[PDB]
Amino acid sequence: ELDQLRQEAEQLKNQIRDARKACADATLSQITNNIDPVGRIQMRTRRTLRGHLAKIYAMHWGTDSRLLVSASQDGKLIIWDSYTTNKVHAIPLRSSWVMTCAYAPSGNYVACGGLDNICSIYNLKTREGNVRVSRELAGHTGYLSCCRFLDDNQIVTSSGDTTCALWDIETGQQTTTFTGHTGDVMSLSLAPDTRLFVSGACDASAKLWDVREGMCRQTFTGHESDINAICFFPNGNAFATGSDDATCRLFDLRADQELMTYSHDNIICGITSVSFSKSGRLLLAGYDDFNCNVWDALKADRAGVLAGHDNRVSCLGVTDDGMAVATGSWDSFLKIWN
Amino acid sequence: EDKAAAERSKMIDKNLREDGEKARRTLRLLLLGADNSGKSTIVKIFETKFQVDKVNFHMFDVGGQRDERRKWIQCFNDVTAIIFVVDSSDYNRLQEALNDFKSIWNNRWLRTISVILFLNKQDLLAEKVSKIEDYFPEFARYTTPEDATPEPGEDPRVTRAKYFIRKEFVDISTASGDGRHICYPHFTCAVDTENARRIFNDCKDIILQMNLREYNL
């Protein structure tokens, strides 16, 4: 009864579309048409970090908003003190092909991974005084695209295996596996409460996941190409996705629909990274055109441009205190902006 | 004040610079091909290292990763060359090899990367031409070019088959590459031992043309 199940799936999809259409009584542009624009956002490179040699592939901020981990293709993590531009740590990696890096919320550990299909958790607070590999997680059958700490003992991972995983670092086992996507999962973002998390893949779809239940809740299907970047709105009721089709989008979980599209005709290059500001009024998106854009999250107008990089803006992050924005590019330089 | 932190950062910088110095002279290659192709046997994630005239070659075979391969090929946009191996003996799967070669050649991040092509398993191709091993494409219209330089003692059917396969791949090459990258066809076998020399020569040509472009020669 393959045809019967196919028809049932099509009918369910039509029902979902009808419910979404019914819920859409207005648009976020119309509702926000009376709110004052944010004006021209001028941001200047306050610090430039020049230790790296190869291309930067990921960075993450510490919860203290001061320390910063960056991963490069030359097989090197660097933990910097941004305030003083001096390197706290330089960790040499077994595999030079790193596509992700995460900083523990407590600051004790730092994770990395890539084409090795392994997520390596490194301990920083060693009594020996050197960063050791606390563990290697080796259950994925595809490249490691992203990873994010929940606490010191749980880490969520996304792979090109078309699956995500919730691990247990002490036992080195996949506590849970999320297996809904039909394509390489390229990014994930962890909710502020850590109960849920969103994942964007190359099937032009994003999915919301319950960490403890282990099941997909909602699937958002607006984009026309791969979703490279995903970030959560600060309040956990929305998220912004950046795709190869030179377009970002906003989705709200409760409405279960797309709200606004951040696109311009002069932009024909895909979005590499997406990040929000502390208030959520600024949506910073890195692009393949060697430069980053700053969008009015509510009015869709382009409020500013960060144009200091001479190669692809590989990664983009915003501090927990909203003080600065760190952009890392394929030119081997990280730049802090404010 | 804590100058010790700055001193530690300076030491970290020294070590990083030394590591970069060590790694700068290694020529990187990305080996990609089908399962039938004899990728492993060429050199005599998976990493391999070899040397020719004291230039280091680091060859990478991704192995267990994506098939669109597009999400990961961007990691290899600064390699010297892409070594593509095609099993010439298998006619039915040769269209698959041609399509994969077209995919790799027109990829956005590989517009500057040159491809070194190895039409492997040549003795099997010779054995299959035999009569029963007819050719799937519309091959009748093709005859060997006036500039053919066959290996001595090669049956003309064999040489025209070889040149047909090579012509197919180089046609896919020239039709879309805007002169920024060049494909280097070679015929190889299981017992062939000159492959490293061929990669060396091709890479020397690659860097020579990169220099010609850097100087606007």
């Epitope: 320390l67 | 100058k3 932190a5 530690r8």
Partner: single-chain antibody, 232 residues
């Protein structure tokens, strides 16, 4: 992590000797190393410092020129060559590791020490009372004063606290007036105001009996105060 110091013994005035420290259990090359001294029945007195990379060396004005500090990272040893000696050098010499980066814990580990017997701009740390009578189960506060404010422009109050139990080497308790060192019970707390600082022990115990020392890491002529002795 263990530092074992060798050398020591009797010497006539004017002699010379090389104290050594063998380090085993940590990345010696990535640490700085301090030579500290304790005269018999007296307090601590910083002697020398050699940094990671052997690129920065500092000496006390009481030993400059006479003493030299060197390190052999390949075989993890730290040497103090004493060239001229006098009665005031008679003391127990300790070796202290100190790693410097953002959020680090300098002065975390101390050696057992070696006895050696010989037959104005510096910041002054004052600890109010020589001793305090204490009883188990109660809370005790130790006071320290600095001649110069230890609050730098970067917000770090560079005061450190150490506890020396009877017959053992000093152990770090707090390293920037507020941060508790690893392995120290939570009962210890530290507060300050830039020139006056207080260390509070919530509940006394048999382990807390000993001499408490304060130190400053603002200007590298590190200065200790005559510690307060908690005995009962």
């Amino acid at each position: 992590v263990q530092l074992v110091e060798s050398g020591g013994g009797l010497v006539q005035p004017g002699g010379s000797r090389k104290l050594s420290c063998s380090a085993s259990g940590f990345a010696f090359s990535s640490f700085g190393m301090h030579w500290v001294r304790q005269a018999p029945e007296k307090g601590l007195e910083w002697v020398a410092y050699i940094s990671s990379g052997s690129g920065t060396i500092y000496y006390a004005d009481t030993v400059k020129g006479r003493f030299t500090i060197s390190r052999d990272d390949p075989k993890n040893t730290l040497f103090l060559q004493m060239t001229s000696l006098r009665s005031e050098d008679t003391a127990m010499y300790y070796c202290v590791r100190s790693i410097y980066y953002y959020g680090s814990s300098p002065f975390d580990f101390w050696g057992q020490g070696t006895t050696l017997t010989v037959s104005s701009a510096d910041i002054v740390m004052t600890q109010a009372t020589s001793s305090v009578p204490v009883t188990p189960g109660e809370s005790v506060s130790i006071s320290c004063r600095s001649s110069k404010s230890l609050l730098h422009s970067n917000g770090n109050t560079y005061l450190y606290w150490f506890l020396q139990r009877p017959g053992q080497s000093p152990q770090l308790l707090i390293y920037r007036m507020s941060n508790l060192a690893s392995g120290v019970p939570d009962r210890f707390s530290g507060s300050g105001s830039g020139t006056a600082f207080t260390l509070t022990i919530s509940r006394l115990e048999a382990e807390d009996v000993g001499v408490y020392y304060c130190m400053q890491h603002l200007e590298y002529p590190l200065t200790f105060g005559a510690g307060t002795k908690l005995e009962l």
